[model samples]
Target: MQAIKCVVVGDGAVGKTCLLISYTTNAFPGEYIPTVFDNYSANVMVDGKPVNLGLWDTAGQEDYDRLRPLSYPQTDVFLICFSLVSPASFENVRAKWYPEVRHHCPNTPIILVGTKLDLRDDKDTIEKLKEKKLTPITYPQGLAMAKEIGAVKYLECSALTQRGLKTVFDEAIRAVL
Candidate 1:
């Protein structure tokens, strides 16, 4: 079996760690545990071929800006994630995440991800964003960002609800193949 190194990047609190935990364990995390250095791997059959999919989780905080890219080497693909209910996180996908990854792995395929899908329609979540004069990121906005960043694909998922989580990794493998 071949190996695919997939790196996850985005602004902090965009649910990158939770996304990986849910995909690998099939359970939602309960607390806010920030990731310093976490590595996740699974063997999957994609089109009758087994693949060793390695997922590297990086901290999105500014403090790790210098240390984070150490894991970027040999990366085959990147998942640039953002919270659907957080416009700031979404903006960083274009402003920060994209440039950082492209600088490290120029030709690596990227999958733009909109995380926290469950919160997009939640009343409390919507009300909170509205209070700030913000709105949950829509599907079209995600797609547009994917196009702007030249991402091979765009997807939305929620670790809490496990919605569209599996497909995010499936498409990741596809992007590499």
Candidate 2:
């Protein structure tokens, strides 16, 4: 079977692991795995083409700064993620993720994703961000970053609620095909 590798990158805790788990299993992960997560393989059909999709997850912590890019080579596409409620993580997409990916695979397609879609409007989450003088990222903001980074698409998904989760991987495959 032909295969496509989609490596996901972003700041730690942005739900990159959950995103992959939900898409492959169609269920929310039972427990958080913290730092590094195991890779997931899946069979999917996009636009009438069958694909052996390999999903790679990377550690976004500074501890993996030197080791993370080892997964960059041979990646057919990248989904750079940021938490919609985490302004800092969103900023890092531009400051760190974009440059790091571009440096290694200058021509590989990138899909900028704003994760934690469910939290974007949750009252509790909003209150917490407000305490820090912040707010959930808006769609326009995500779109602008997608443009700035030259990402082929801008997407938002919530792994917990499973909203818009399937589309992420589907889009990843389409970006490569």
Candidate 3:
């Protein structure tokens, strides 16, 4: 079986670990803890193609930022997740995370994921609108960033609802293979 080394990176509470766990293990935890650096492996068969996915979830803390550049080089696919609820994390991906990852893994396949799509209540959206002081542009912004960064795909996912999670991994695996 062919294997792809995939890494998910983003700031804390951006649903990095949740997405991975939900997609691969069908599990989701409600609590948040600072995961320093963790690796999990899963075998996914998509369209009859058996692909082993070695997934690395990186700590989003500033203290662990130095390890990211080194981590990117070994990855075949990179999923940079940001929260739809927090536009600042999305901005951080544009300003700091994406560039640093690209510097290390220049030609690797990248996917930009906007997580927590289940929180689409008008109240939450309104809160985000007020917090960012910007127009509602989550999907558009994510797609734009993917295009700008030459990502293979842009996905809006919700681990809570398990929406778009399988598609995200399937597309990523297909792109890598």
Candidate 4:
């Protein structure tokens, strides 16, 4: 069996754990203690071959930022997540997350995920009042940053609703398989 190690990185409240839990177990909680470094291993058949996926969900605390390079060694795939509702989180994904991943695992397949898409319709309404272009800017910035970092793919997902969740992992598996 072939195996792939995937690391999920993002700021706090960006839904890294939620996304992981939803994908791995098809479950979601209304609340979760922010993750420091949650690790889980699962096996899934891809292309008619058994592939083990080792997943790590890292804490978003600034104090833990330095540990990323060391913790992320041997990663085959990196999922950099940002909250669709928070511009700061999105900016951090571009300014910090992507760069750190590149520094540690430059050749690894990368995926940029914009989480909390279930809130998009409501958020978009508020965005229109605040700035007519805010919604497009948020999602587009993520897509643009993914391209800049050579991400294999980009997805907007809502762990709460499971929307686009399968595509996230399936595409990632396809990319690395």
lDDT of 3: 0.78
Per-residue lDDT of model 2, residues 1-177, tens digit only? 779988999987587767777777788876764444688777887899899989888865546666888889999999999999999999999999999899999999999998999988899999998999999999999999999999999999988898888888889899988
* Steric clash pairs (candidate 4): none
Kindly indicate the candidate among 2 and 4 with the higher TM-score: 2
Every candidate's lDDT: 0.88, 0.87, 0.78, 0.78
lDDT of 2 at 42: 74
What is the TM-score of candidate 4? Answer: 0.85
lDDT value for candidate 1?
Answer: 0.88
Q: RMSD to native for every prediction?
A: 1.7, 1.6, 2.3, 2.9
What is the C-alpha lDDT profile of model 3 across 85-162, one tens digit per residue?
A: 777778888888789888888888888888878774558676767766754337888888889888889999888888
Which pairs clash inside model 3?
A: none
Which of candidates 2 and 4 is the stronger one according to lDDT?
A: 2
Of 1 and 2, which scores higher on lDDT? Answer: 1
